Amino acid sequence: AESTLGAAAAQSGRYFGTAIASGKLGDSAYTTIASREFNMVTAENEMKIDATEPQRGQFNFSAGDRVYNWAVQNGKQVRGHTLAWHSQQPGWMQSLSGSTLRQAMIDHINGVMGHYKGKIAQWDVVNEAFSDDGSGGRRDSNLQRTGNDWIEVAFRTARAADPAAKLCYNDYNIENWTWAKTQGVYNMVRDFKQRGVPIDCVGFQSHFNSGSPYNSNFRTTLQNFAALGVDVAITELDIQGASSSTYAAVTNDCLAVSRCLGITVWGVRDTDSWRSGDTPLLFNGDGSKKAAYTAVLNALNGGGQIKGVGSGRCLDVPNASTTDGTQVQLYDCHSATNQQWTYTDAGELRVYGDKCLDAAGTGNGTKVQIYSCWGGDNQKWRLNSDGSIVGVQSGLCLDAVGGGTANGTLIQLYSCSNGSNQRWTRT
Amino acid sequence: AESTLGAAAAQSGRYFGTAIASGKLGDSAYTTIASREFNMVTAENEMKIDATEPQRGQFNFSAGDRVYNWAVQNGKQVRGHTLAWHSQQPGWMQSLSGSTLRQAMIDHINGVMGHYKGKIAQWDVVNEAFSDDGSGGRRDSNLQRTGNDWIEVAFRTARAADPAAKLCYNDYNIENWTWAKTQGVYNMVRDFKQRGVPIDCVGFQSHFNSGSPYNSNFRTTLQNFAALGVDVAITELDIQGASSSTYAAVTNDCLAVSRCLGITVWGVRDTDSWRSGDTPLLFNGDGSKKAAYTAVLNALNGGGQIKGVGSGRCLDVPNASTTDGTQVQLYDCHSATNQQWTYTDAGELRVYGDKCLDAAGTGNGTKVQIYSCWGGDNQKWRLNSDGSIVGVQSGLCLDAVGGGTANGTLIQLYSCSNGSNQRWTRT
Numbered sequence: 001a002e003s004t005l006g007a008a009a010a011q012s013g014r015y016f017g018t019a020i021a022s023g024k025l026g027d028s029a030y031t032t033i034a035s036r037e038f039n040m041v042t043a044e045n046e047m048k049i050d051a052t053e054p055q056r057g058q059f060n061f062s063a064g065d066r067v068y069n070w071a072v073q074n075g076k077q078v079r080g081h082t083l084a085w086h087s088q089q090p091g092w093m094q095s096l097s098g099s100t101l102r103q104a105m106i107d108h109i110n111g112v113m114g115h116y117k118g119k120i121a122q123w124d125v126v127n128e129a130f131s132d133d134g135s136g137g138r139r140d141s142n143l144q145r146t147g148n149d150w151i152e153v154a155f156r157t158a159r160a161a162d163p164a165a166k167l168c169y170n171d172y173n174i175e176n177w178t179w180a181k182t183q184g185v186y187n188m189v190r191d192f193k194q195r196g197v198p199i200d201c202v203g204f205q206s207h208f209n210s211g212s213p214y215n216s217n218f219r220t221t222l223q224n225f226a227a228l229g230v231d232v233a234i235t236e237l238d239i240q241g242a243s244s245s246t247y248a249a250v251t252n253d254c255l256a257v258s259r260c261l262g263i264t265v266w267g268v269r270d271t272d273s274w275r276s277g278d279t280p281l282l283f284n285g286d287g288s289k290k291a292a293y294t295a296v297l298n299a300l301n302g303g304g305q306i307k308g309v310g311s312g313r314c315l316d317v318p319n320a321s322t323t324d325g326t327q328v329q330l331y332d333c334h335s336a337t338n339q340q341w342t343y344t345d346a347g348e349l350r351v352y353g354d355k356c357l358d359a360a361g362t363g364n365g366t367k368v369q370i371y372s373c374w375g376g377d378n379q380k381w382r383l384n385s386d387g388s389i390v391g392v393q394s395g396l397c398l399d400a401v402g403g404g405t406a407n408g409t410l411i412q413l414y415s416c417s418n419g420s421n422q423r424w425t426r427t
Numbered sequence: 428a429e430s431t432l433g434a435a436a437a438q439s440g441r442y443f444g445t446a447i448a449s450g451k452l453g454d455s456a457y458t459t460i461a462s463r464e465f466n467m468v469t470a471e472n473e474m475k476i477d478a479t480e481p482q483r484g485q486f487n488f489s490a491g492d493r494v495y496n497w498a499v500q501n502g503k504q505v506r507g508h509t510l511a512w513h514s515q516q517p518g519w520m521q522s523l524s525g526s527t528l529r530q531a532m533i534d535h536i537n538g539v540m541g542h543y544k545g546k547i548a549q550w551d552v553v554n555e556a557f558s559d560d561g562s563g564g565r566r567d568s569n570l571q572r573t574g575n576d577w578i579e580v581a582f583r584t585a586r587a588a589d590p591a592a593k594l595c596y597n598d599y600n601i602e603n604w605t606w607a608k609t610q611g612v613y614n615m616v617r618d619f620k621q622r623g624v625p626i627d628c629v630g631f632q633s634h635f636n637s638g639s640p641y642n643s644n645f646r647t648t649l650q651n652f653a654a655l656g657v658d659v660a661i662t663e664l665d666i667q668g669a670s671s672s673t674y675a676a677v678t679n680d681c682l683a684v685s686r687c688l689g690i691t692v693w694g695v696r697d698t699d700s701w702r703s704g705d706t707p708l709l710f711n712g713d714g715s716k717k718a719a720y721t722a723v724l725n726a727l728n729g730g731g732q733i734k735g736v737g738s739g740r741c742l743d744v745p746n747a748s749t750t751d752g753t754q755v756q757l758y759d760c761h762s763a764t765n766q767q768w769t770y771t772d773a774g775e776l777r778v779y780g781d782k783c784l785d786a787a788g789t790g791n792g793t794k795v796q797i798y799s800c801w802g803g804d805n806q807k808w809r810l811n812s813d814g815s816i817v818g819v820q821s822g823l824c825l826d827a828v829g830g831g832t833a834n835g836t837l838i839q840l841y842s843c844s845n846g847s848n849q850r851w852t853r854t
Contacts, residue, residue, distance in 0.1 A: 210796065215752070241798075324637065
């Protein structure tokens with residue numbers, strides 16, 4: 001299929017997943033989207049060390065199993081997250097070191113993987129072991145202090161516990177090839193593969209924002225790692241601002257690499273995000289598809305003026321008016337500024353640089369006009385591959401009033417119908 | 428003093444006020460902004476009918492007085508809101524009709540005004556009496572059903588209760604001259620003035636959004652009413668999206684009409700707004716001045732490339748790259764898209780049409796770069812009259828590193844100090 005992210009990824013043998021919080025499994029708006037769009041699930045916190053072994057030797061899999069069962073029952077594979085980590089260790093584990101800690105780490109791995117043996121597709125065996133200090137060296141943690149070979153030991157232990165699972169090393173800020181951290185990790189995987197240490201994949205968290213932005217050399221990093229013989233996976237993707245171009249770029253980078261298994265966005269709706277303030281996901285709080293959703297789906301499915309298919313006329317701001325509240329119309333196409341629209345990464349259709357195509361409401365018959373740009377959802381649009389233009393807030397289509405084709409025919413929001421007065425062609 | 432909204436408005440004999448909610452007076456973030464910027468206060472809910480006369484004949488002024496006391500302790504005047512209205516009537520009053528309702532209306536006016544006799548600058552005597560149906564006629568309410576003269580009676584009653592107060596009729600959607608509602612109200616005021624009914628002002632709520640956008644003909648509406656011999660006031664100003672241009676325009680309309688007493692914005696911070704989702708105010712949830720704050724301030728005080736005054740060099744995007752994360756620098760001025768910056772209504776500095784000047788942080792030394800435009804506060808800037816450019820989120824100034832005047836000097840955020848390397852001029 002090609003209507004949902006998971007189905008469209010499946011076409012090239014990949015998956016499109018999300019992080020699931022068991023706390024939201026009761027929320028129907030949440031499960032409706034999650035069940036429909038994704039085919040891979042990562043438990044947000046449920047499979048962490050603190051959650052699965054609250055007390056030494058005493059394993060708890062209630063929350064983890066809840067997420068796991070939901071996933072399998074809804075046709076999704078699962079990524080285990082995570083076995084050894086310097087962060088979120090239960091207090092009992094923080095009170096350990098040396099041989100005792102090393103042993104605890106091993107017991108925890110066997111305990112968790114044993115419970116889930118044969119039913120987890122990929123495991124993030126070791127998470128965030130490298131430093132951010134620009135050294136490209138490991139981070140000083142109680143685990144690292146037990147011995148530099150702990151990472152190798154963890155992977156060897158993991159392989160033994162469940163040989164059916166793909167074992168990955170997971171980390172953030174290893175996306176830009178030029179970074180000292182990316183090099184540090186690369187060198188470790190290189191070494192591991194040379195010495196036969198069991199590592200099947202490298203997960204790239206992909207938490208992009210203005211502090212650590214996406215760079216096109218990400219495709220290069222993915223290709224260099226894949227050239228070592230490991231699979232690569234985009235594991236916790238979210239982009240500050242949810243730029244349509246950046247989401248499409250990351251998606252195409254995965255598609256360009258045969259060893260890229262798939263992509264997992266870190267959450268369902270912006271409000272579910274650990275960084276909701278950055279509106280970094282594909283669905284907004286209302287559960288509606290953002291402009292980025294369409295950019296991602298179109299990328300997975302394969303690879304100026306706005307002219308009405310039914311009329312052969314262009315979207316025009318009457319007499320080149322700049323006043324807010326001016327309703328747009330159809331008019332003979334001509335090379336004028338009032339007929340030139342720019343679709344931004346935020347999902348706006350700008351004219352005159354700072355005026356936005358705006359919906360004055362959410363119902364059928366709603367007037368489509370220009371108004372100062374401010375980032376409201378009523379000024380965000382989705383340009384579908386079928387030629388329809390859907391408002392993000394309303395979910396309705398741009399519609400030439402009454403099917404009119406003459407100059408002066410007005411534009412409104414209306415139930416999408418695949419009609420020609422709802423079909424547009426960017427030129 | 429031209430540094431605060433109130434003091435700046437006072438330079439033209441006007442005031443700049445806000446709506447104060449008593450429940451927020453214990454929040455110093457809230458009161459710090461409120462006591463500093465405004466010189467006129469309207470109680471948001473505390474002087475309403477239900478709040479002041481909970482039971483028939485039993486007046487309660489505890490809440491209203493908390494708003495009043497604060498206002499006078501902090502040197503502000505007060506607008507009373509509101510004495511007669513079809514909305515938010517206490518239960519006992521909603522049950523009344525005919526002459527019984529009519530007398531209760533009179534009793535309420537005498538009761539509230541008597542308590543605040545001589546302490547209130549203006550009173551919104553009757554509020555929202557006109558219909559939105561397009562007839563330009565009266566709204567059907569229990570009050571209007573007591574007889575058409577109820578408005579006249581409310582004014583005659585109020586004048587006798589406190590002859591020291593300016594008595595206003597207050598309504599919304601009466602800003603655009605062309606609307607039936609506006610002209611319906613104009614005719615009522617004209618009738619009153621010619622029959623000697625005591626009315627001193629008309630309050631235009633001015634709640635502007637895309638369904639009811641600001642229109643430049645607002646200035647003729649204001650002039651039309653002032654010509655009737657009544658003072659005019661903008662009473663509950665808020666603009667969906669808080670466009671700098673629209674906010675400056677409304678401000679200039681009041682400044683152009685000598686009988687325009689002042690402007691009251693409906694709330695302090697965006698999160699204090701009854702329409703917070705529209706981010707319609709002058710301070711964001713953090714208590715930071717938005718781009719619109721600057722536009723209003725500049726308008727009250729009398730009111731391409733970006734050259735650093737200290738270097739005589741332009742803000743430049745290295746090699747004309749469009750990669751997120753590219754830090755900006757100073758460079759010999761010249762016509763190049765990578766030197767052309769567009770300041771938008773939202774407060775962004777766009778380059779290449781969809782890249783925005785971006786602060787990757789809030790502290791001193793923070794790097795200033797370009798990043799896909801998305802609307803974050805770290806991409807919002809205030810262009811002050813003194814030549815500085817302040818980041819909305821950080822409160823820091825664009826600072827040419829080390830005072831560097833040479834090509835290649837990097838731009839960073841740093842504490843404002845009005846040095847030459849922090850003053851910029853546009854072209």
